[PDB]
Amino acid sequence: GGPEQLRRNLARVVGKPPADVPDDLIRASLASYARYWREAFRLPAMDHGRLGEQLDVIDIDHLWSALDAGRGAVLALPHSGNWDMAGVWLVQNYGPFTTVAERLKPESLYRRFVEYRESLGFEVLPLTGGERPPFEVLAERLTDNRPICLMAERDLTRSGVQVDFFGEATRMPAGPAKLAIETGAALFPVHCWFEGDGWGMRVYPELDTSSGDVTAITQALADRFAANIATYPADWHMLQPQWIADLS
Ligand SMILES: CCCCCCCCCCCCCCCC(=O)O
């Protein structure tokens, strides 16, 4: 990917040709992208207790009430803001939670990322090469009334769910919907962004899972993801291709 790509993606968000995306927006998005990596470097060494105390989550009671009901919960969020910081907040305010991560190449790099996230207090299951299938483990967490977190706006594989996203076709992962259907767990959209020199985080009302249609649910997730991103366009650092048309 790159920043030329990032321009093509922001173009969808604001409904303008790539050339007309406001310069101020591109700068802030690039600044935001840099900030994530800058924070990732030092995050493991910060005072996690302090961060948990000083950062807030809007409408966190949504999550708490699902957990009071014994239902478990799926936190689905886009690549906006600093999701790693949100994870630290949850470890401190709730406890360890489970997630999954793509097994990058090289293997030395995958382990590095695992060590990183493990040092933040997450359980990260490999999508491949683990003892068991990841989405069985996730389901057990949900059935024990625990939260899992999933990055949920990108999955450009055969198995990704085809959805409309800012008026154009993309594919998103099916996991959040599958798990909610399977476990009865609440499916909460989440958004993270940068609010000045700090971090914004919000939980939104759980999604309607009545249809039992993985497609309708995932599309409803996208509709929300799209709305929030339209609200915080600069905080969504997507440098890789997102929409199908931008692919090989
Ligand atoms: C109520 C707000 C709390 C939300 C907590 C979200 C924590 C997410 C942790 C993500 C860990 C790994 C995902 C990154 C992998 C990737 O998509 O490149």
Catalytic residue, chosen from 79, 191, 206, 237, is 79
User: Any idea which residue has 């929030």 for tokens?
Assistant: 228
Is 182 labelled as part of a ligand binding site? yes
Decide whether any atom of ligand 1 lies within 6 Å of the 120 Cβ. Answer: no
Measuring CA to CA, how many Å separate 90 from each of 79, 93, 137, 142?
17, 5, 19, 16
Q: Which residues contact 18 (CB under 8 A, 6 or more apart)?
A: 7, 8, 11
Pocket test for ligand 1, best of 55, 56, 91, 99 (most atoms within 8 A of CB): 99
CA torsion angle 144 149 153 157 (round to 10): -70
243/246 Cα distance (integer angstroms): 6
- Indicate if 140 belongs to the active site: no
Decide whether any atom of ligand 1 lies within 6 Å of the 186 Cβ. Answer: no
Is 159 labelled as part of a ligand binding site? yes
Q: Whose Cα sits closest to atom 15 in ligand 1?
A: 101
Q: Whose Cα sits closest to atom 6 in ligand 1?
A: 87
Taking the centre of ligand 1 as the mean of its atom positions, its distance from the CA of residue 58, in whole angstroms, is 17
Atom of ligand 1 nearest to the CA of 203: 1
Q: What are 184's two structure tokens?
A: 């009865």
Taking the centre of ligand 1 as the mean of its atom positions, its distance from the CA of residue 248, in whole angstroms, is 28
Q: Which residues contact 6 (CB under 8 A, 6 or more apart)?
A: 26, 29, 30, 33, 237, 238, 239
Atom of ligand 1 nearest to the CA of 151: 17
Cα atoms in the 13 Å half-sphere on the side-chain side of 52 = 14
191/151 Cα distance (integer angstroms): 10
Long-range contacts of 193-200 (CB under 8 A, 24+ apart): 193/80, 193/81, 193/232, 193/235, 194/32, 194/35, 194/81, 194/82, 194/234, 194/235, 198/55, 199/55, 199/81, 199/82, 199/85, 199/86, 200/58, 200/81, 200/232, 200/235
Decide whether any atom of ligand 1 lies within 6 Å of the 99 Cβ. Answer: yes
Is 79 labelled as part of a ligand binding site? yes
Q: What are 89's two structure tokens?
A: 């907040």
Ranges of beta strands (E only) in 21-175 are 73-77, 98-101, 123-126, 147-151, 161-165, 168-172
**Residue 16, helix vs strand vs coil:** coil
- Indicate if 123 belongs to the active site: no
Resolution in A: 2.9
Is 117 labelled as part of a ligand binding site? yes
Contact call for residues 185 and 144 (beta carbons, < 8 A):
no
Decide whether any atom of ligand 1 lies within 6 Å of the 74 Cβ. Answer: no
Contact call for residues 153 and 79 (beta carbons, < 8 A):
yes
Q: What are 241's two structure tokens?
A: 């291709």
Angle, alpha carbons 210-213-219 (nearest 5°): 100
How were these coordinates obtained?
X-ray
Beta strands 198-203 and 186-195 are antiparallel
Q: What are 48's two structure tokens?
A: 């996690």
CA torsion angle 92 57 188 117 (round to 10): -40
